[PDB]
Amino acid sequence: HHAPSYRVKRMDIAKNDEECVVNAANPRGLPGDGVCKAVYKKWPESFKNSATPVGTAKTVMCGTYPVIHAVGPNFSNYSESEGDRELAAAYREVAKEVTRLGVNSVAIPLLSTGVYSGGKDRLTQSLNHLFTAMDSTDADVVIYCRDKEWEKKISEAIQMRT
Numbered sequence: 001h002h003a004p005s006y007r008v009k010r011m012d013i014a015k016n017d018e019e020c021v022v023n024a025a026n027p028r029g030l031p032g033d034g035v036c037k038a039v040y041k042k043w044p045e046s047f048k049n050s051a052t053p054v055g056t057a058k059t060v061m062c063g064t065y066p067v068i069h070a071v072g073p074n075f076s077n078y079s080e081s082e083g084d085r086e087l088a089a090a091y092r093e094v095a096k097e098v099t100r101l102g103v104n105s106v107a108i109p110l111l112s113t114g115v116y117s118g119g120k121d122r123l124t125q126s127l128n129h130l131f132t133a134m135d136s137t138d139a140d141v142v143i144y145c146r147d148k149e150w151e152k153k154i155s156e157a158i159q160m161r162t
Contacts, residue, residue, distance in 0.1 A: 004138040006131075006158045010151040013144035014042040016107035020059075022094055024109045024116075025069035027054055034114040035144075043067050054078075055089035057097050068097045072111030072126075075118030087112050087126065091133035098139050105140040110154075123150055127157055 013021060013035055021043075024035040029050035031040040040047060046067035052058035057070040070093065073086035090111055098106050110126040127143075134141050143158075145151055 005140050006134075006143065007140070008143045008145065008151055008154040008158060010145055010148060012038050012146075013107050013109050014038045016142065016144065018105040018107040018140070018142055019103040020066035020068060020098070020101060020106050022057075022068045022070050022106060022108040023050075024111055024114065025050065025052070025058075025071050027051060027071050029069065035109045039067065055086040055093070057090060057093035059097050059101065066097075066101050066103070068094060068101075068106075070094045070111055072116055074116040075112060075120065075122070076116070083112070083118075084125070087129050088132065091129045095133040095137050098134075098137055103139055105142065107142050107144055108134075109144050123153060124157075127154060131161075 023039040026032045029047045031037055043062050046060045046062045048060060050058055050060050050069045052069060052071055054071050054073050057068050059066050059068045070090045072090045073083040075083045078086060113122045113126050143154055145154060
């Protein structure tokens with residue numbers, strides 16, 4: 001009867017200690033930048049046939065370790081309305097993959113907050129969708145960020161729900 005938890009860590013997600021990782025992927029399975037680039041530096045072979053549409057997730061196993069490539073929308077290309085739907089869908093596929101894989105924990109970045117943000121602060125939007133999808137899962141979720149003010153805000157958002 002372990003208590004499923006949410007935690008935040010301010011560090012490179014490629015160094016995670018969880019049972020699987022969510023990559024903030026692009027649709028074509030390219031090395032990309034930011035989080036995707038850091039994931040490519042550690043598990044480049046996880047990009048073998050990882051291309052998948054926006055709003056979906058595709059898991060590639062690296063030995064026993066799952067890399068869940070979750071493709072959020074680029075808000076430079078998507079409208080606020082359609083991008084919101086796609087961002088929800090990506091996270092819903094993450095929850096389904098995490099459940100299917102039977103993992104006890106998962107490392108997850110905030111989708112669509114880096115170069116896909118359209119130059120808007122999307123912390124609250126992305127985190128809200130992350131919770132909406134992951135709340136009904138029982139895996140321990142560890143959210144990764146790099147910015148210290150973002151760490152504070154994510155931590156505050158987690159603490160205030162209980």
